Design a protein around this ligand. Structure first.
Ligand SMILES: [Cl-]
Ligand SMILES: [Mg+2]
Lengths: 283, 287
C-alpha cells in the first residue's frame, strides 16, 4: 500500500463510524484475490448481500443497514478491482471472472441462496450473477444499475473524466446528487481520498466481454429469479423511464418503479422509502 | 489561480525538455485576453504570412516538433496552447461555450495582428478550427483539419473508457498502446511530458460539461455553411470513430472540401506520418 492508499484506508475506517449498528470487517479469500466484507445482523438470520456503487465502497450503506440488518445477516462486499479495500489478483476483466469471484464469496461465506441488493456497478454485477448462478439467488433488488438496460449518456463520461481535477469531486457529486445536500462530510472525505488514490492495482483493459455492459433483449428475457428495479426520476447517467421501459419489455414479471425526488444514489437520498420498499419485496 | 504545485513544476520541467526537440529557433510568450494568459510558441520568418497551429487534447503545442521545421520555413507560425487544456496557458473564468472559445481565438488573432491566417488543428484543435472557421470565416484563409475531436461523428465509447484509465498505474501506456496501434512513434521525452500533465491534477478547474461547449458534432446545415477551403485528413487506423464514415459525412456536406484517409496512420497522424502530412498540408495551402 502506498501513502495515498494508507490514507484511503484511514478514511474508510472513519466512514464506518457512521454505521449505526455493530459490524465486523474481515477478508475472504477468492480465486481473484482477498475480498473485504462488512458483516451485520443476527448470525442465524437469512443472508443478504450488498454490492455498492462504483467508487463508493461498502461504507455507503450506513443509511440502510440498521433496517436491513435487523432481519437479515447482511454482508456488504467490496467489489474486486473497484476503489475500496478488496485486493484483486489475476482478473482478466471478463463477466465470467466477476461471476466466479462472487460465487467464491458465496461459497466462503457459507451462503446457499441469498437475497441481493446492488446499486450502480453492484446492480450490474447483480444482474450478471442472477443470470449465471440463478440457483444461488432468492430475489434481487437492482437500484440505478450501471448500464445494464441502457448505455451511459456521454455526460457521465464528461463528469467522470473531470473527477481528478481541482473541484472535480464537488462538480461530479453536485451533478449526480442534483445539487442536494445529501452525503455526510466524512463519507465525502473517503470518496475524495479514493479518487486521489491512483497508484493501486491496475485496471483490466477495456473489454467488450467485461463491464460496463448492456444486456441484449434475449439476455434480459432469460432472467429466472424475481427482480425489483428502482430508478430515480432525476437519474443523470441515462433516462430512467426509457430504462424502465426496456427492463419491463423483456425481464419477465419484473417489479419496477421510478422514484420521485431521487436520482442515481437513491438509497442515500430516500433511505426511509427505499429501505421499506426493498424489504417489502423480499417478504 | 493556485501557486504552481510540485506536480505543476514537474510538468513545466517536462514541457521545457520537450521543447528541446524543436528543430528551429522559437520564442515563448503570453497573450493577455478576457479569458486568461495564452501561451504561444512562435517560429519562422518574422515577415512571413501567418499560420496558427492548434494541438490535440492533453498534448500541448510541443507536439508539433515533427512538422515545424517544414511549416515554419515558409510561415510565421504560431503554436497556440488551447486555453484551459493541460499546457502552459493560464485560464481565467472560461465559460467553456463554443461562442467564448471562438471569441478567445479572435482576441489571440487580434493581439497577434493577424488579418487572415491559414490554420492547422488536430483532434481538439481541429474542433476549435472548424468552430472558428464557421463563425469567423473572414479571419481564415484555408484550414487543415486533422483527426478532429467529434465534429463529424460522436466519440466511440472506447475513447472514454481508455481516457478514464489515464490516471491509474499503467494508464498512459495502455491509452497510448490503444490509440497508436501498439507502435513506438512518440519521442520518450514527449511521452514523459504527456504523463506529467496527466499527473498534474491540482491546477486550473475545468469548465463544467456543457451541451453548448466542446466536444460537439456539427449539424448538416452547420457543415453546409462552411465558406473557406478545408483539408480533412483522417487515419486509416483511427480509433475514436470510423474514419470512412467521418470522411463520407464531411464530403457530403462541406462545400469544396478536400478529404482523405491516410495509410499507415491513426489518430495522431501528424506524428505518425510527418513527411507525408507536412507536404500534403503545404500543397493544400500553397495553391
Ligand atoms: Cl405491495
Ligand atoms: Mg490546391
Amino acid at each position: 500500500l502506498s501513502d495515498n492508499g494508507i490514507r484511503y484506508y484511514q478514511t474508510y475506517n472513519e466512514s464506518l463510524s457512521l454505521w449505526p449498528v455493530r459490524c465486523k470487517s474481515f477478508y475472504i479469500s477468492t480465486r481473484f484475490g482477498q475480498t473485504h466484507v462488512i458483516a451485520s445482523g443476527p448470525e442465524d438470520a437469512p443472508p443478504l448481500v450488498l454490492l455498492h456503487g462504483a467508487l463508493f465502497s461498502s461504507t455507503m450503506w450506513y443509511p440502510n443497514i440498521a433496517d436491513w440488518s435487523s432481519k437479515y445477516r447482511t454482508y456488504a462486499v467490496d467489489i474486486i478491482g473497484d476503489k475500496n479495500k478488496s485486493i484483486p489478483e489475476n482478473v482478466s476483466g471478463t463477466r465470467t471472472d466477476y461471476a466466479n469471484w462472487l460465487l467464491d464469496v458465496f461459497d466462503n461465506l457459507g451462503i446457499e441462496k441469498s437475497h441481493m441488493i446492488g446499486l450502480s456497478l453492484g446492480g450490474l454485477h447483480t444482474m450478471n450473477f442472477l443470470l449465471r448462478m440463478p440457483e444461488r439467488v432468492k430475489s434481487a433488488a437492482i437500484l440505478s444499475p450501471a448500464e445494464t438496460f441502457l448505455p451511459f449518456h456521454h455526460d457521465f463520461y464528461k463528469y467522470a473524466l473531470g473527477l481528478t481535477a481541482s473541484n472535480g469531486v464537488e462538480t461530479f457529486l453536485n451533478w449526480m446528487m442534483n445539487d442536494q445536500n445529501v452525503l455526510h462530510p466524512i463519507f465525502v472525505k473517503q470518496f475524495k481520498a479514493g479518487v486521489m488514490w491512483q497508484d493501486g492495482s491496475r485496471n483490466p483493459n477495456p473489454n467488450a466481454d467485461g463491464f460496463p455492459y448492456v444486456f441484449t433483449d434475449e439476455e434480459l428475457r432469460s432472467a429466472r429469479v424475481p427482480i425489483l428495479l428502482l430508478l430515480g426520476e432525476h437519474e443523470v447517467i441515462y433516462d430512467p423511464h426509457s430504462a424502465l421501459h426496456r427492463a419491463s419489455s423483456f425481464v419477465p414479471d419484473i417489479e419496477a418503479e421510478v422514484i420521485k425526488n431521487a436520482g442515481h444514489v437513491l438509497s442515500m437520498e430516500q433511505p426511509t422509502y427505499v429501505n421499506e420498499r426493498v424489504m417489502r419485496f423480499f417478504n
